[PDB]
Design a protein around this ligand. Structure first.
Ligand SMILES: CC(C)(C#Cc1ccc(-c2ccc(Cl)c3c(NS(C)(=O)=O)nn(CC(F)(F)F)c23)c([C@H](Cc2cc(F)cc(F)c2)NC(=O)Cn2nc(C(F)(F)F)c3c2C(F)(F)[C@@H]2C[C@H]32)n1)S(C)(=O)=O
Ligand SMILES: CC(C)(C#Cc1ccc(-c2ccc(Cl)c3c(NS(C)(=O)=O)nn(CC(F)(F)F)c23)c([C@H](Cc2cc(F)cc(F)c2)NC(=O)Cn2nc(C(F)(F)F)c3c2C(F)(F)[C@@H]2C[C@H]32)n1)S(C)(=O)=O
Ligand SMILES: CC(C)(C#Cc1ccc(-c2ccc(Cl)c3c(NS(C)(=O)=O)nn(CC(F)(F)F)c23)c([C@H](Cc2cc(F)cc(F)c2)NC(=O)Cn2nc(C(F)(F)F)c3c2C(F)(F)[C@@H]2C[C@H]32)n1)S(C)(=O)=O
Ligand SMILES: CC(C)(C#Cc1ccc(-c2ccc(Cl)c3c(NS(C)(=O)=O)nn(CC(F)(F)F)c23)c([C@H](Cc2cc(F)cc(F)c2)NC(=O)Cn2nc(C(F)(F)F)c3c2C(F)(F)[C@@H]2C[C@H]32)n1)S(C)(=O)=O
Ligand SMILES: CC(C)(C#Cc1ccc(-c2ccc(Cl)c3c(NS(C)(=O)=O)nn(CC(F)(F)F)c23)c([C@H](Cc2cc(F)cc(F)c2)NC(=O)Cn2nc(C(F)(F)F)c3c2C(F)(F)[C@@H]2C[C@H]32)n1)S(C)(=O)=O
Ligand SMILES: CC(C)(C#Cc1ccc(-c2ccc(Cl)c3c(NS(C)(=O)=O)nn(CC(F)(F)F)c23)c([C@H](Cc2cc(F)cc(F)c2)NC(=O)Cn2nc(C(F)(F)F)c3c2C(F)(F)[C@@H]2C[C@H]32)n1)S(C)(=O)=O
Ligand SMILES: [Cl-]
Ligand SMILES: [Cl-]
Ligand SMILES: [Cl-]
Ligand SMILES: [Cl-]
Ligand SMILES: [Cl-]
Ligand SMILES: [Cl-]
Ligand SMILES: [Cl-]
Ligand SMILES: [Cl-]
Ligand SMILES: [Cl-]
Ligand SMILES: [Cl-]
Ligand SMILES: [Cl-]
Ligand SMILES: [Cl-]
Ligand SMILES: [Cl-]
Ligand SMILES: [Cl-]
Ligand SMILES: [Cl-]
Ligand SMILES: [Cl-]
Ligand SMILES: [Cl-]
Ligand SMILES: [Cl-]
Ligand SMILES: [Cl-]
Ligand SMILES: [Cl-]
Ligand SMILES: [Cl-]
Ligand SMILES: [Cl-]
Ligand SMILES: [Cl-]
Ligand SMILES: [Cl-]
Lengths: 207, 207, 207, 207, 207, 207
């Protein structure tokens, strides 16, 4: 990543073995659960496009998703080229192309040059926004259960039902559907509460 | 987080893989036990609102609690706006809104600017206080057993009973109830001790 | 903790995830064995009162001991107030109270101010001494076996017996009792050695 | 590796135990899966030829591949000598040979001298490009299944089939073959979609 | 420990959680095997007497050995007082006593003052030499098997026998006894080799 | 080890717990496999003779090999004394002896003085070369199988056979013997290939 040293200047740092292993492990354990996306964003703090491509390529398996990611990246790369239509002088920064932001036609020194410019061209943050966009579309598609099928069981604790409800809702990307899909006993209690009840009040009443 | 370097200036640091993994793991293992809250506070030392949102979003599951957390955060964010009613000049700090402190309408550079100002606007500590408030309400609600039902067994060691008693009491958020819920043999000993006995004296007498 | 940087000045550092996890784990594995106390002291090197309270609060369970710890802390806090009886000027250090040293009525900035003063008021070391005092009283009470009941078995190796003997003695908080509680065969050998024998000589003779 | 300190100068650093162990472990677990190559590239960030040889030599087993790697390295080393045909003055940098870039006839001080020169001779990056070239040829040869034999099962979820398809394709080093190898039911749906369908659209239709 | 910063001055550093855990773990796994002593010496690099006492006190169990260690320490402390017989002026270093070097009557600031003096009084290295002396006496006593009882089996590989032979010899604290305790077949071969054979030659001949 | 700080000067650093544990673990898991030697060389980057002796002494077991190592070290130490035959002035570097390079008659300060001299006397690298020499002789002797006995099985995959072939060859310290020891079916194919075939071509043909 590009990180500021202990003297106030932005310099390049090698991606750490702890960072590399943490990203690989979370994909192995959680696949494309919704909480994997913020983990990717945190673990790629200050990452260059090269670092972002590194993280994606260390993922073995889920290659269907990785190809969807490339398609989303190319869509965003093509949009950037339509919003930013371009001899380049000696020793002198060039504007980046979509494929430059994606790290495919640009060198690390070029990415360092853009990201540390004054003002900086944050090709890493632009690329990361493309990746998260594509990652979120994967999260929705891999969500196994629709919110319409999350209904509280006749003996299911309300707490467990709300857990499944909003876990599903988070991947699908509320309060009245949560009441409608509650079981008959709790749904009866939740209507007596009236409108405007908080989740805390609702869960307390069906305890 | 925002941490001071080895030269005496406050700069931004990327949240570490060790920090990210430590928060995720403790939630996986302890859920919303009372001791999870001080762990969250320590692991979020110097955190920005972005870092605080990062930590919350890496939690998979317990999504019912996370939605209660959002409701508490919005309540505190709405209160801040009622206590701090607001053209913004070029290059110049703006007062934060409730959603700015919660990291939803503010950028990282803006959060860095507030937290490192002189005097600093500690939007991270303000947000953290909101989160801990909401986290504590979750701890009370998820406490499975009431203090009224913690009574020493006829053969239960007094040490084990006091452990369960104050473990329950900590989540519920004393000395006379501890005597009343003791078993007949120990309760007899504890009355002979008289008032003002310490916990050490009480546990010694029923050993 | 408060640690000196690489330039010779005392500044605040966030308690590390490795430190937090190491304290939690040792309590989970060893409870209140005697060797847990020096581990707590080492892991709290340079800790502020806030850091000391952090470490105590990350302990889940053993809540009976934690309440005994609070009682000991309040006793020491009350003593400090009796030994140090107190408008506070603008921007100007105030003497600490017992509850200030215990981190309950003092801010982190105040604790940093005391600990880094010239001369420093080591509220962290004062608090730590209170905690270790209370922790040691827990170690004695949780010692399951009295030294009077540690006697060498008729076929127990002398090495194993001495291990149990001084393990028990360490928690209870010597040489002649070790001879008296030895088995008949070894006790006969140990009297023939005479007075003033070292532990090495004693263990060698009963090998 | 050669890394810039916190003062802006490139100096030598010892390869870390975390780096050494991370490379060994990934080879033990994944052998020559395609994602092992980007892991090698990231873990060898800023590596000298000595560091690159270190990483290769810590690999136990897969010695057939390591000998293929040497053959590829010698081929690239011989090419470099044909593109760069060479008394060397006292204290004065010499041009490198193919075996110098491969770390076999050059010292660490010589590699440091080339890599930190102005302008730098990046013998580490040149060597790394040779290694990755040879590593990729191993990935293709060790790919067990050909893309022609990746066909969706009659009850295999389309997602799982695309995973295997592009996993195989990645090692072999698309969209119309993916349709042809789909099962009859899904292939019927995919033709109705028409040309130019994205992977996301294709996977959605066969869900 | 006392370690030099990145600016060339000796300052105090808190003993690390990795150091504390590494010492505890090696004692748990290897007890008082001979190789535990050099591990203790390496892990206590630059340690103060306080750090050395910390490491000893984190050891749970083996309390018989720890009491032998104290007896050896007191013997060396008494010797130092006999070799170094002693108003102390304000703000001014005092010569250390045996108990000062052992960390029992001296503060950390005093130990820092001695160790960083010019010229330095290395109370840490003096104490460490006392500890290693006592630790080595424990290694000899806990050696279970005498060298006289290490004899090669009639079908035992010579390599395995030499391993046990010098493992035992290392704890007991050679070449002709190794031949005498070899089995008849190998002993016959080893006499034909003649005097002055290396261990490599000896092991080769009995392979 | 001796490592350069972040200011460009060579200073002493304590051997890290990660380094110590990594060397011990690899010996426990791999014994004297060929790849253990480059691991030792990397983990001893910049090591002093004291650090090199530390690493050897933390190895428990394999004491036969460690005694062969001492014999090789003494041989190299005796050679150095024959190539470098020696009042030493106050405060003034002395030439090292063989036992000085091996760390047996020299202090750490003396080793630091030699290694950081201008020009430096690299007693650590000289000692390390002695150790690796002796370690390699152990690798050859502990190789269980000779290359003459590595022959491809009638149903053994050629890839697996080449793996065993060069694994054995690496420890023993090629292309025509690999053909001769192939099975009849593959050997027939390999002769049809003709001379000068690469390993990649050979393995491809027998696939
Ligand atoms: C950069 C990056 C790392 C980021 C970010 C990021 C940025 C801002 C915010 C946020 C913070 C506080 C509030 Cl009060 C609101 C709000 N208030 S409101 C009117 O109630 O919605 N909204 N937001 C998002 C915003 F921006 F959209 F406004 C927020 C979040 C929250 C952080 C959070 C997590 C948590 F657990 C509990 C919290 F209290 C807060 N994370 C989400 O909210 C995700 N989420 N989604 C849904 C669903 F859809 F199912 F309902 C659900 C959540 C949920 F909160 F987890 C919980 C079960 C419900 N994260 S990134 C690109 O990788 O993602
Ligand atoms: C920032 C953050 C990390 C913090 C903080 C924080 C700040 C201050 C204090 C504190 C410190 C010392 C004393 Cl003497 C008292 C006191 N003296 S008194 C008159 O006896 O109560 N009070 N306090 C709290 C205060 F502030 F309220 F005053 C304290 C604590 C204690 C730390 C502590 C833990 C411990 F194990 C043993 C100790 F000796 C001290 N932690 C708690 O006390 C929580 N707790 N709750 C209850 C219950 F309710 F069940 F009884 C119980 C505890 C318990 F101690 F664990 C124990 C079983 C009993 N923590 S945060 C926002 O994440 O939490
Ligand atoms: C800050 C902190 C981390 C500290 C400290 C701290 C400070 C000083 C000392 C100490 C050091 C050397 C000597 Cl020679 C003596 C001594 N000489 S003497 C006349 O023989 O007793 N005394 N001391 C304590 C002093 F200060 F009281 F003098 C010491 C210790 C020893 C360190 C030690 C541990 C060890 F394993 C082996 C050693 F050789 C030395 N640790 C203890 O001694 C605890 N202990 N208790 C008993 C029992 F009671 F059962 F007998 C037993 C021990 C035992 F040693 F483990 C062993 C089985 C016997 N630690 S803290 C507040 O968290 O604790
Ligand atoms: C230095 C080093 C570490 C590097 C690099 C490196 C450099 C650039 C790029 C890259 C980035 C973005 C796009 Cl949009 C394209 C593109 N757009 S396009 C017209 O669709 O192909 N192409 N590229 C490569 C380029 F350079 F060739 F252009 C890219 C990659 C991608 C990174 C990536 C991984 C991922 F998972 C998902 C992504 F969105 C992006 N990694 C690959 O693409 C490897 N891969 N191969 C195939 C296959 F062949 F099977 F189809 C498949 C992949 C796959 F993506 F994983 C996925 C299943 C499909 N890596 S190194 C020497 O060690 O490797
Ligand atoms: C500070 C500290 C960490 C230290 C140190 C320390 C200091 C110096 C030396 C040393 C180095 C090289 C040589 Cl050539 C000789 C030598 N040459 S010689 C004429 O043949 O003996 N002697 N020495 C010791 C010296 F100083 F005494 F001279 C050495 C050692 C060796 C290091 C070593 C370990 C190893 F595995 C293989 C090696 F090649 C070298 N470690 C020992 O030798 C311990 N050992 N003991 C015996 C036994 F007794 F069974 F035979 C046996 C060993 C053994 F080597 F392991 C092996 C099985 C045989 N360590 S500390 C206080 O914690 O210990
Ligand atoms: C300091 C230290 C850490 C070092 C070093 C060190 C220094 C240089 C080199 C080296 C690098 C590149 C080439 Cl192209 C050749 C070459 N070209 S050539 C004409 O084909 O032989 N030769 N060399 C050695 C040199 F110096 F001798 F020239 C090399 C190596 C290689 C590194 C390497 C490992 C690898 F896996 C794959 C590679 F492509 C390169 N490591 C070895 O080669 C060891 N090895 N041995 C044999 C055997 F004998 F069985 F055939 C076999 C290997 C093998 F490669 F693993 C593989 C199965 C075959 N390491 S240290 C003192 O601890 O060891
Ligand atoms: Cl995966
Ligand atoms: Cl790739
Ligand atoms: Cl821009
Ligand atoms: Cl509930
Ligand atoms: Cl969870
Ligand atoms: Cl999210
Ligand atoms: Cl404010
Ligand atoms: Cl008790
Ligand atoms: Cl616990
Ligand atoms: Cl608490
Ligand atoms: Cl004071
Ligand atoms: Cl014994
Ligand atoms: Cl392997
Ligand atoms: Cl090798
Ligand atoms: Cl070039
Ligand atoms: Cl799908
Ligand atoms: Cl132990
Ligand atoms: Cl103790
Ligand atoms: Cl001295
Ligand atoms: Cl052998
Ligand atoms: Cl071993
Ligand atoms: Cl030793
Ligand atoms: Cl020389
Ligand atoms: Cl093959």
């Amino acid at each position: 990543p590009i990180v500021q040293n202990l003297q106030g200047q932005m310099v390049h740092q090698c991606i750490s073995p702890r960072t590399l292993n943490a990203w690989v492990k979370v994909v192995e354990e959680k696949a494309f659960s919704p909480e994997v996306i913020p983990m990717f964003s945190a673990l790629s703090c200050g990452a260059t496009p090269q670092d972002l491509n590194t993280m994606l390529n260390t993922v073995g398996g889920h290659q269907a998703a990785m190809h969807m990611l490339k398609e989303t990246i190319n869509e965003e790369a093509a949009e950037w080229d339509r919003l930013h239509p371009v001899p380049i002088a000696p020793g002198q920064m060039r504007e980046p192309r979509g494929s430059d932001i994606a790290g495919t036609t640009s060198t690390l020194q070029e990415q360092i040059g853009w990201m540390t410019h004054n003002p900086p061209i944050p090709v890493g943050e632009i690329y990361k926004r493309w990746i998260i966009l594509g990652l979120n579309k994967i999260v929705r598609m891999y969500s196994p259960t629709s919110i319409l099928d999350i209904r509280q069981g006749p003996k299911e604790p309300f707490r467990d039902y709300v857990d499944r409800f909003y876990k599903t809702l988070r991947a699908e990307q509320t309060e009245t559907l949560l009441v409608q899909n509650a079981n008959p006993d709790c749904k009866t209690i939740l209507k007596a509460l009236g409108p405007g009840a908080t989740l805390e009040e609702m869960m307390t009443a069906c305890q």
